[PDB]
Amino acid sequence: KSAVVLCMDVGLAMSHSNQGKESPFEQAKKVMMLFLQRQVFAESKDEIAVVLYGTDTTDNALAREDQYENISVHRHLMLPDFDLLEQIENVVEPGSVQADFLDALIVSMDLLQKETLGKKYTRLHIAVFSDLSSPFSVDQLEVIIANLKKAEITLQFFLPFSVDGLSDQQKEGIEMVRKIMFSLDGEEGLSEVFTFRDALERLSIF
């Protein structure tokens, strides 16, 4: 059995549309929905968790004054169910703020480390869905990466664009993501940054 954390960006900008295109919040939702129900209807033994960053409410274990703010744990590590599908499909809504995605990554890493004790898991994975239009601090980044390697936590990013009308912060986020992914697995790591469109296509074949 594997443990997967869906780290979804629900910031204000996630609801912004361009030229009538589907907002990245909707795109990320479709990908998450298609993945979840595929796990549910397949009787998969993989347990899923969902962390949200950008929520107007703060609800995580590491939350403190100016520490991991606007990050909420929507679903703890357990098997996916029809309730989760209903929640992701109609309950989860975008927030009014922009949270630090690296703080969210840490929360996801802490959620796995704490809720995986003793239990035997074959793979630990974190999937991030975001438009990268949120500011973030790089404090102790090298420690985050080392713990990802030490804990054997693979990583994937899903964006509304390819790596090439982007904002300043969005361009800054791209480089940080590519930096992280290259340090984890080099070229093979860079190929683990997908678009919502591409991911939706792959998740519709067997």
Partner: peptide, 6 residues
Amino acid sequence: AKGLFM
């Protein structure tokens, strides 16, 4: 393949 496509 790996991750969500695993």
